[PDB]
């Protein structure tokens, strides 16, 4: 619930659950616990709910590569504790 769960020695949690965190330019970070086929959009919308952001205003990158809402933990090959980076993005309309 509001507690932190142990995970030492556990690769994957029951039916392919793994955790990722998303960190902004400003050093603000939220983590999420997500399943392997589930799109990155789910954590992104959750980020907006928790940490007070608008979804079209934020876009995610992995090491200088754009990652898109249709992309995934399977597709980007995310870990049990992944780290994903945010840029605040001008969308032109």
């Amino acid at each position: 619930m509001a507690d932190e769960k142990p995970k030492e020695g556990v690769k994957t949690e029951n039916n392919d659950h793994i955790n990722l965190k998303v960190a902004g330019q400003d050093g603000s970070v939220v983590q999420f616990k997500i399943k392997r086929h589930t799109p990155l959009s789910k954590l992104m919308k959750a980020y907006c709910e928790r940490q007070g952001l608008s979804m079209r205003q934020i876009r995610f990158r992995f090491d200088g590569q754009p990652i898109n809402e249709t992309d995934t933990p399977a597709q980007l090959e995310m870990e049990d504790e992944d780290t994903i980076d945010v840029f605040q993005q001008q969308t032109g309309g």
């Binding site: 029951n14 939220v30 616990k33 589930t38 980020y47």
Partner: peptide, 11 residues
């Protein structure tokens, strides 16, 4: 421990 998400059923 922040976000446990779902759009798939939980398990």
């Amino acid at each position: 421990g922040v976000i446990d998400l779902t759009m798939d059923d939980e398990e």
